[PDB]
Enzyme design. Structure first.
Site, PDB file in Angstrom:
ATOM      1  N   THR D 136      86.328 -15.221 133.003  1.00 41.78           N
ATOM      2  CA  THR D 136      86.126 -16.626 132.674  1.00 41.78           C
ATOM      3  C   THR D 136      84.978 -17.239 133.467  1.00 41.78           C
ATOM      4  O   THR D 136      84.244 -18.078 132.935  1.00 41.78           O
ATOM      5  CB  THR D 136      87.412 -17.409 132.927  1.00 41.78           C
ATOM      6  N   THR D 170      86.921  -6.798 144.637  1.00 46.29           N
ATOM      7  CA  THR D 170      88.279  -6.888 144.128  1.00 46.29           C
ATOM      8  C   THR D 170      88.412  -6.488 142.666  1.00 46.29           C
ATOM      9  O   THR D 170      89.541  -6.372 142.179  1.00 46.29           O
ATOM     10  CB  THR D 170      88.826  -8.312 144.307  1.00 46.29           C
ATOM     11  N   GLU D 174      83.624  -5.244 138.032  1.00 44.69           N
ATOM     12  CA  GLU D 174      82.841  -6.379 138.518  1.00 44.69           C
ATOM     13  C   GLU D 174      81.341  -6.237 138.281  1.00 44.69           C
ATOM     14  O   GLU D 174      80.724  -7.212 137.817  1.00 44.69           O
ATOM     15  CB  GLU D 174      83.150  -6.601 140.004  1.00 44.69           C
ATOM     16  N   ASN D 197      81.581 -13.949 149.858  1.00 46.99           N
ATOM     17  CA  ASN D 197      82.744 -13.961 150.736  1.00 46.99           C
ATOM     18  C   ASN D 197      82.530 -13.105 151.976  1.00 46.99           C
ATOM     19  O   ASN D 197      83.037 -13.441 153.051  1.00 46.99           O
ATOM     20  CB  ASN D 197      83.971 -13.473 149.973  1.00 46.99           C
ATOM     21  N   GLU D 245      64.125 -33.651 143.112  1.00 47.27           N
ATOM     22  CA  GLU D 245      63.246 -33.149 144.161  1.00 47.27           C
ATOM     23  C   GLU D 245      63.570 -31.707 144.520  1.00 47.27           C
ATOM     24  O   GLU D 245      62.676 -30.952 144.918  1.00 47.27           O
ATOM     25  CB  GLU D 245      63.342 -34.048 145.389  1.00 47.27           C
TER      26      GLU D 245
HETATM   27  N1  LIG Z   1      85.572 -18.528 148.057  1.00 44.65           N
HETATM   28  C1  LIG Z   1      86.581 -18.253 147.237  1.00 44.65           C
HETATM   29  N2  LIG Z   1      86.462 -17.222 146.332  1.00 44.65           N
HETATM   30  C2  LIG Z   1      87.484 -16.933 145.493  1.00 44.65           C
HETATM   31  C3  LIG Z   1      88.657 -17.667 145.534  1.00 44.65           C
HETATM   32  N3  LIG Z   1      89.490 -17.163 144.599  1.00 44.65           N
HETATM   33  C4  LIG Z   1      88.873 -16.138 143.971  1.00 44.65           C
HETATM   34  N4  LIG Z   1      87.632 -15.980 144.523  1.00 44.65           N
HETATM   35  C5  LIG Z   1      86.612 -14.993 144.139  1.00 44.65           C
HETATM   36  O1  LIG Z   1      86.577 -14.833 142.735  1.00 44.65           O
HETATM   37  C6  LIG Z   1      86.123 -13.532 142.438  1.00 44.65           C
HETATM   38  C7  LIG Z   1      86.620 -13.041 141.081  1.00 44.65           C
HETATM   39  O2  LIG Z   1      86.616 -14.036 140.075  1.00 44.65           O
HETATM   40  P1  LIG Z   1      88.013 -14.369 139.349  1.00 44.65           P
HETATM   41  O3  LIG Z   1      89.057 -14.599 140.414  1.00 44.65           O
HETATM   42  O4  LIG Z   1      88.404 -13.196 138.488  1.00 44.65           O
HETATM   43  O5  LIG Z   1      87.824 -15.721 138.486  1.00 44.65           O
HETATM   44  P2  LIG Z   1      87.870 -15.855 136.872  1.00 44.65           P
HETATM   45  O6  LIG Z   1      86.539 -16.282 136.310  1.00 44.65           O
HETATM   46  O7  LIG Z   1      88.916 -16.881 136.511  1.00 44.65           O
HETATM   47  O8  LIG Z   1      88.313 -14.448 136.233  1.00 44.65           O
HETATM   48  P3  LIG Z   1      89.683 -14.289 135.409  1.00 44.65           P
HETATM   49  O9  LIG Z   1      90.844 -14.411 136.364  1.00 44.65           O
HETATM   50  O10 LIG Z   1      89.715 -12.935 134.739  1.00 44.65           O
HETATM   51  O11 LIG Z   1      89.767 -15.370 134.361  1.00 44.65           O
HETATM   52  C8  LIG Z   1      86.626 -12.662 143.580  1.00 44.65           C
HETATM   53  O12 LIG Z   1      85.631 -11.750 143.980  1.00 44.65           O
HETATM   54  C9  LIG Z   1      86.934 -13.622 144.710  1.00 44.65           C
HETATM   55  O13 LIG Z   1      86.127 -13.345 145.830  1.00 44.65           O
HETATM   56  C10 LIG Z   1      88.787 -18.708 146.443  1.00 44.65           C
HETATM   57  O14 LIG Z   1      89.822 -19.369 146.491  1.00 44.65           O
HETATM   58  N5  LIG Z   1      87.741 -18.997 147.295  1.00 44.65           N
HETATM   59 MG   LIG Z   2      91.186 -16.199 135.572  1.00 46.42          MG
END
Ligand SMILES: Nc1nc2c(ncn2[C@@H]2O[C@H](COP(=O)(O)OP(=O)(O)OP(=O)(O)O)[C@@H](O)[C@H]2O)c(=O)[nH]1
Ligand SMILES: [Mg+2]
Ligand SMILES: Nc1nc2c(ncn2[C@@H]2O[C@H](COP(=O)(O)OP(=O)(O)OP(=O)(O)O)[C@@H](O)[C@H]2O)c(=O)[nH]1
Ligand SMILES: Nc1nc2c(ncn2[C@@H]2O[C@H](COP(=O)(O)OP(=O)(O)O)[C@@H](O)[C@H]2O)c(=O)[nH]1
Ligand SMILES: [Mg+2]
Lengths: 46, 427, 430, 430
Positions: D136, D170, D174, D197, D245
């Site tokens: 997403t 994760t 990816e 991260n 800017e």
């Molecule tokens: N900084 C930060 N990064 C996050 C957090 N939660 C998830 N991530 C990052 O989000 C990355 C992956 O994206 P997703 O969690 O899959 O988000 P998404 O677009 O909703 O993907 P879907 O769950 O499949 O819909 C991971 O590598 C995490 O590092 C958070 O609370 N803070």
């Molecule tokens: Mg999701």
């Protein structure tokens, strides 16, 4: 004599900096890092 | 954060080790149930060297116990400090020891080898850092000598960098507890020379001589004998656990005392050992410790240093004392007896100081030295092994296990070359 | 104002250091917490209106020495970043402290010293302490200076190191480390002062009345010299000496830099009550072989330029008469091309006594730094000890295994040999 | 007046947004319910009476994260049409979040964005949050930008995305998702900022002394940057920087737009006790490799222009002195055809703290956004990871089954290849 204002304005900061931010942080991390001990429970016996 | 993994093999290893943890637990102040009940903050500084923490203030030592028959272990657990150890580190067979080096090495060793290594892997990779391992075993037996050497090779292959310090008991000259000792010791030496970094040699006869001469123990038991060994193993690692004016850990000791890769076998001694009635007359001085450490009768190995020459010597001092007084004695003892030291290495005596002494004793000292007198100990076993080998003696027991006769010729050839190597450096 | 940075290496450097800063906080009037119950800027920084911090970095590859400071009463004074501890020490092995383990921590420390140099607006130099026999003292000390040489360049890097003693020794591999570090020291260091424990043992038993000393008392005596050396930058005086002046005045050539130390009066409390201790008396006591902090007799060699630093009640008239008299002494030699031969400084602020110190309180004292050819005696002994072991090659395997190439052993051995005749050529006259 | 719209897509965006709106409401002084116990109008709308409503749209195709907000404290704050949820998530599949499932909810989402903008007399930009690896975050995020380009045209569209970390990962699929989304981002986005991260974790341990962070702690750090970014529109100061800017100052070409971010000081209470942290120090802390929020060393490449923002009692005299010092740093390389190299920003509103926070109430802080060529190596890591899968066709069946054409896979590889070429040609010698 605006320099008299500056001394108070910055000592007020570092007293807040020292007592509250540090002590709040010390107690919080003492609790947070010592809740890694998660010693089960008698209900486990299934 | 210099964690050390402790391994005990055989009846000799398990009983010595059980006494060893009684010494450390009292020194740090750990209740036998495993909880800290001590008296000083300095004790909790570096308890991580030997212990792990179980959730809820219970401390567990980094101990692994190995035996082929489970009789000795259940005897250990019934001991007062038996409850301390982790139950799943008890690794045992269900077969007789056999008192046979070949049987322990090949028949029962291979089955237990895989299980023991993963137990090692748990403790080895559960710590932030690892300085080295610590092995206690005897050479006259079959389980400690046979399986102990097999684990020594496996540890080196996986973990080449770490210090594999070992403590060994050598079969006695006069009265000994096993007929086939010349075979057991000769085969084991080939493994120790190439794999282990440091080996300390203890003779049971010298322990009896020390008890009757100095301590005047009217009826010594194996508890008293193992008491003496526990202090030396306590003293060497004390530099890791407590602060000092001059630190000297294991890696320092190996570098200074070992000039060449194969000459690393050592003698040890401990001062002060005081008689019952001589106590009221003996005054604690730093020279008083120096006299006992270098006195030939105090050595725990029944090889006389005067018959050979020293290569290196090292002394540790425990307690608060003057640094000048310690350094002066090492200079004095070196110049007074120059006939027992090698010319081509000056300043043969290394020294160190530690702050916290053993409980109640306001000073103490430990000695580790390297000398050419070990040709005496190996000539003895070579002579007996020769007469046992010239005609085939008990050997048929070893051949029926898988061992080739060429291994005996390989074993003694390596052993005899190590004798010659000490002969040459005497020149 | 004008700033100096102190760097401490190894067990010797660290536990000398906390002794020195114990003196300095006591001298200026700063409580252990950094507060007060001037010349602070040369050594300290003010955070906001109340709190001071040393310009120091403590470095060692093992945590036992550093953590003693971390749990001590002085722990609140230092910045947590300044106390840097490694994981496992070098085991008195130069190769381990230079190549394998030294490079694991070198870049972390270099940022921290550089960051402290930003706060020093008018920085003029650094002080670095070593123990030659130590692995980190010699191994990592060489790596630190090699990087520091190109980092800052034209800044005066002074060193204060402990030469291994003629007979007193605690490490078997001690000659190996000293020679290897010497080759790196000689090109990069601007000037480095020699001291040894054996001479400090004899002085602190004979002059100072102590039967059984420890490293603690010796660390005090080192602090007195460094305090007087820095006294010109901090407090008023009739003849000031900056750091850059020592560099030009003392060393005749690039490689001959190594001076030696002396201090007088060193006297017990109940003997200083008994003796006058004027300006001429303390000047005479400096030149006796017994007061030398390096156990080499200057009568074996000759003197080049010497530097004198006086503190307390000394008046410039009495100074000139005293040093003129010492020229009449025919038990003291000078090379012919140094007729002037002296650099003098006079400061007003007396030495600072310590709670429970052994030194008495004289209202006038003198410190000396002298450069002499007698140091070549020490190099010969160190060379002989190294030569015996290297012939049969008694310890090469440990160094080679830890990243060191053998070809460095003879090259550093030749560089010392060149220095030996460097001193013999200077000793000659025309 | 001047207003900005915030849209949060995926778990990584909406969870960060929770921290952002806590910090904004605490800074302005609005209770979490939307009432009071100014610059409000740039982030909030005043519905009437005494109630405030944010300009935020929360979107994810599964309701678990959104239902936390609907049940959380802030449920009284938002306008529940703003809270948009699908039925089943994209399962980290780009095609699923773009072709099959993403198109089910897109037209409802665009209505809320354009309805939110009608109440905005003077809008000047957008803020959109992504994580590249998510289905997403990337698949639906790409579809969102493609439509907003035709919906709104020449309005600056700024993104804040978590860049896929070097070694911490994760999702196995990816690398596939990032390259596909990279093609869509490169043409439509006005400028997209990078954080990752892996650097934030190490930053959250070394400077902030936290044993084991969570996603909560990292989300607050990102919130500070956005709050510092938008403060020029909210509070008074001395050198204001509008959104437009950023577009001209930072990016020299069309396809070199991706910057990286930095912030200073991020310090705990213990260390700030010992440190004054004036203007010159905080400017030097910015350029260290440790403080970069993307784990790439700037020393590998060169710098194009950077933008600097100061929050506090900062005097313009000190700003020019610090940056002039920074140009004296020889370890930082600038490109010759960027001799100007900097834009400054100064504002009087100090940083805002949070109960249960991790940071200190420093009097001043600086935020850095930088454009560099060192991030060209970061893509080459992503390119190498992508090639190993596709040489053996490692996960093609999942994407093809959800409407994705295979021909897009080599094309996305082609666009990244051109982008990698563009960086080496820009960084080349004049
Ligand atoms: N900084 C930060 N990064 C996050 C957090 N939660 C998830 N991530 C990052 O989000 C990355 C992956 O994206 P997703 O969690 O899959 O988000 P998404 O677009 O909703 O993907 P879907 O769950 O499949 O819909 C991971 O590598 C995490 O590092 C958070 O609370 N803070
Ligand atoms: Mg999701
Ligand atoms: N004057 C003085 N000398 C000391 C003191 N402590 C140690 N030394 C000298 O330091 C030398 C020993 O080396 P270390 O102090 O351990 O130096 P190091 O670099 O830390 O050695 P490593 O253990 O390899 O790290 C000996 O020659 C001592 O004489 C001290 O407190 N005062
Ligand atoms: N010092 C000491 N030696 C022992 C002890 N128990 C046995 N020994 C000696 O160890 C030698 C061989 O022991 P053994 O039973 O073969 O141990 P194994 O390695 O398990 O086979 C014998 O000569 C015993 O005298 C003890 O508690 N202390
Ligand atoms: Mg050290």
């Amino acid at each position: 004599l605006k320099a008299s204002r500056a001394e108070e304005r910055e000592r007020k900061r570092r007293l807040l900096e020292n007592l509250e931010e540090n002590r709040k942080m010390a107690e919080s991390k003492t609790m947070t890092r010592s809740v890694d001990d998660l010693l089960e429970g008698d209900k486990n016996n299934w | 954060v210099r964690e050390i993994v402790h391994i005990q093999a055989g009846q000799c290893g398990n009983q010595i080790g059980a006494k060893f943890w009684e010494v450390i637990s009292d020194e740090h102040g750990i209740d036998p149930t495993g909880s800290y009940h001590g008296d000083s903050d300095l004790q909790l500084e570096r308890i991580n060297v030997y212990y792990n923490e179980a959730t809820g203030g219970k401390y567990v030592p980094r101990a692994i116990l190995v035996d082929l028959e489970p009789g000795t272990m259940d005897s250990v657990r019934a001991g007062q400090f038996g409850q301390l150890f982790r139950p799943d580190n008890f690794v045992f067979g269900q077969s007789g020891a056999g008192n046979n080096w070949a049987k322990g090495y090949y028949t029962e060793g291979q089955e237990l080898c895989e299980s023991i290594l993963d137990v090692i892997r748990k403790e080895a990779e559960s710590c932030d850092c690892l300085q080295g391992f610590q092995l206690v075993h005897s050479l006259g037996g079959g389980t400690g000598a046979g399986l102990g050497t097999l684990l020594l090779n496996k540890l080196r292959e996986e973990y080449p960098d770490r210090i594999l310090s070992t403590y060994s008991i050598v079969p006695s000259p006069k009265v000994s507890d096993t007929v086939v000792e010349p075979y057991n010791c000769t085969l084991s030496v080939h493994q120790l020379v190439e794999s282990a970094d440091e080996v300390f040699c203890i003779d049971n006869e010298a322990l009896y001589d020390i008890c009757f001469r100095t301590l005047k123990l009217t009826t010594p038991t194996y508890g008293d004998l193992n008491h003496l060994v526990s202090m030396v193993m306590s003293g060497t690692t004390c530099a890791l656990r407590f602060p000092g004016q001059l630190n000297s850990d294991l890696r320092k000791l190996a570098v200074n005392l070992v000039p060449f890769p194969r000459l690393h076998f050592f003698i040890v001694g401990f001062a002060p050992l005081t008689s019952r009635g001589s106590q009221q007359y003996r005054a604690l001085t730093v020279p008083e410790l120096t006299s006992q450490l270098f006195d030939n009768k105090n050595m725990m190995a029944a090889c006389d240093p005067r018959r050979g020459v020293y290569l290196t010597a090292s002394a540790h001092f425990r307690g608060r004392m003057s640094s000048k007084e310690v350094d002066e004695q090492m200079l004095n003892i070196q110049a007074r007896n120059t006939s027992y030291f090698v010319e081509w290495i000056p300043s043969n005596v290394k020294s160190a100081i530690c702050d916290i002494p053993p409980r109640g004793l306001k000073m103490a000292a430990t000695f580790i030295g390297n000398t050419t007198a070990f040709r005496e100990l190996f000539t003895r076993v070579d002579s007996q092994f020769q007469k046992m080998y010239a005609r085939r003696a008990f050997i048929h027991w070893y051949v029926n296990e898988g061992l080739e006769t060429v291994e005996f010729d390989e074993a003694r050839s390596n052993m005899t070359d190590l004798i010659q190597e000490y002969e040459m450096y005497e020149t | 104002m004008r700033e100096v940075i102190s760097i401490h290496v190894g067990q010797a450097g660290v536990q000398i250091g906390n002794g020195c800063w114990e003196l300095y906080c006591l001298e200026h009037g700063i409580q252990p917490d950094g507060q007060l119950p001037d010349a602070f800027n040369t050594f300290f920084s003010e955070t906001g209106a109340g709190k001071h911090v040393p310009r120091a970095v403590f470095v060692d590859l093992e945590p036992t020495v550093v953590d003693e400071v971390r749990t001590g009463t002085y722990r609140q004074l230092f910045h947590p970043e300044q106390l840097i501890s490694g994981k496992e020490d070098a085991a008195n092995n130069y190769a381990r402290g230079h190549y394998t383990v030294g490079k694991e921590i070198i870049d972390l420390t270099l940022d921290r010293i550089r960051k402290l140099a930003d706060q020093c607006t008018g920085l003029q130099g650094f002080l670095i302490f070593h123990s030659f026999g130590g692995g980190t003292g010699a191994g990592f000390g060489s790596l630190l200076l090699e990087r520091l040489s190109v980092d800052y360049g034209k800044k005066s890097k002074l060193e204060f190191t402990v030469y291994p003693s003629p007979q007193v020794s605690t490490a078997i591999v001690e000659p190996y480390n000293s020679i290897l570090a010497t080759h790196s020291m000689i090109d990069h260091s601007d000037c480095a002062f020699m001291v040894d424990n054996e001479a400090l043992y004899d002085l602190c038993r004979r002059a100072l009345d102590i039967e059984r000393p420890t490293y603690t008392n010796l660390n005090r005596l080192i602090g007195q010299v460094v305090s007087s050396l820095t006294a010109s930058l901090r407090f008023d005086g009739a003849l000031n000496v900056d750091f850059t002046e020592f560099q030009t005045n003392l060393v005749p050539y690039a490689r001959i830099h190594f001076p030696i130390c002396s201090y007088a009066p060193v006297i017990s409390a109940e003997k200083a009550y008994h003796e006058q201790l004027s300006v001429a008396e303390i000047t005479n006591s400096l030149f006796e072989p017994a007061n030398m902090m390096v156990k080499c007799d200057p009568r074996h060699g000759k003197y080049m330029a010497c530097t004198l630093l006086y503190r307390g009640d000394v008046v410039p008239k009495d100074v000139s008469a005293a040093v003129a008299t010492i020229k009449t002494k025919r038990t003291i030699q000078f090379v012919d091309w140094c007729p002037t031969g002296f650099k003098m400084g006079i400061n007003y602020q007396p030495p600072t006594v310590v709670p429970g110190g052994d030194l008495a309180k004289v209202q006038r004292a003198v410190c000396m730094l002298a450069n002499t050819t007698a140091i070549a005696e020490a190099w010969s002994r160190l060379d002989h000890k190294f030569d015996l072991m290297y012939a049969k090659r008694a310890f090469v395997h440990w160094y080679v295994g830890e990243g060191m190439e053998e070809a460095e052993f003879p090259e550093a051995r030749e560089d010392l040999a060149l220095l030996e005749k460097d001193y013999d050529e200077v000793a000659a006259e025309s």
